[PDB]
Amino acid sequence: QGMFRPQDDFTYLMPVHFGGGKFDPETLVTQKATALSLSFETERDLLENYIPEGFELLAPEVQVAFNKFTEINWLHGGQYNLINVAAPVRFHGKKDELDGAYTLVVWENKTAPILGGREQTGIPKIYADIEDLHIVRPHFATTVSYEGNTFLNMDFEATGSITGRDLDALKSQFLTMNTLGWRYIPKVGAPGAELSQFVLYPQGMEVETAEVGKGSLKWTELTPMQSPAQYYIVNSLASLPIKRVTQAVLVEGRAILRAMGARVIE
């Protein structure tokens, strides 16, 4: 008989049998970060279709942000990019009430954080190719694509540096974020869920420098042959009219995250 048994005060991910690590309440994710952060106004009714019962949509707004993380401690010095898509919500739990960003989808260009995000915290991470920013100052751009098929373009024209009070306001702000997810695991060979729970991951970045500017984005609808596992996600978000881009900032700094600060909410 097999000799593998999990240890009591350890944490794991599949494959568990190759071992894991001692639980530490003060486990950290540390990394350098750049973010291009946009908000756009859309149609409330249409966006509500994508927000689960239990949450209230606080504003007819979608938040879309490119982030690039470098010198990542838990990846022993590697890097990755992500596109975050969220909506501002209030959670009306039976135990917890709080405001945050309901995560719609996150694209990332590396699998390891995808697995971790989904399995540990119910963040709806999926893969895409995500260019680092192309820069002809004052212009910044990225492109996101699935197997050669473009589906999101972002552009930003920096118009000025944020300093003084306004930078304090910006900093103080970014420092605290309530990221909300939904960890769902399906039944095996049957409809429905084996596990289904909402999750809060408190995070924040320490902004060092910031610019304001003119932001834009564009979705390109995809066919199943183009993006078989994601076409309907893309096409759903593309259906949300971009009425106006209301916010656009480019920030540079670091993050120090208490990964064990995540918790189930209900």
Beta bridge mates, 251: 35, 210
Does residue 223 belong to the site contacting Cl ion (CB under 5 A)? no
Does residue 95 belong to the site contacting a copy of itself (CB under 8 A)? no
> Which contiguous run of DSSP H or E holds residue 100?
strand 97-108
Per DSSP, the residues of 226-259 read T-TTTHHHHHHHHTS---EEEEEEEEEEEEEEEG
- For tokens 């910044």, the residue is 140
For a copy of itself, the closer CB: 205 or 240: 240
Query: Least distance from C-beta 114 to Na ion, angstroms?
Result: 8
Does residue 135 belong to the site contacting a copy of itself (CB under 8 A)? yes
15 preceded by a cis bond (ω within 30 of 0): yes
- As a whole number of angstroms, the distance between CA 77 and CA 176 comes to 25
- The site partner of 33 among Na ion, a copy of itself, Cl ion, none (C-beta below 5 to 8 Å per kind) is none
| Tokens representing residue 40 in the block | 């756009």
Query: Least distance from C-beta 168 to a copy of itself, angstroms?
Result: 28
Query: Least distance from C-beta 147 to a copy of itself, angstroms?
Result: 6
Does residue 256 belong to the site contacting a copy of itself (CB under 8 A)? no
Backbone angles phi, psi at 230, to 5 degrees: -135, -10
- The site partner of 17 among Na ion, a copy of itself, Cl ion, none (C-beta below 5 to 8 Å per kind) is a copy of itself
Does residue 217 belong to the site contacting a copy of itself (CB under 8 A)? no
- As a whole number of angstroms, the distance between CA 26 and CA 3 comes to 31
Binding test (CB under 5 A) with Cl ion, winner from 131, 157, 221, 252: 131
Does residue 254 belong to the site contacting Na ion (CB under 5 A)? no
Q: How far apart are the first and last CA of the chain?
A: 41
- As a whole number of angstroms, the distance between CA 82 and CA 131 comes to 10
Does residue 204 belong to the site contacting a copy of itself (CB under 8 A)? no
Does residue 77 belong to the site contacting a copy of itself (CB under 8 A)? yes
Binding test (CB under 5 A) with Na ion, winner from 7, 49, 73, 111: 111
Task: Tell me how many residues contact Na ion (CB under 5 A).
Answer: 23
- The residue ranges that bind Cl ion (CB under 5 A) are 111-112, 126-127, 131, 143, 147-148, 202, 258, 261
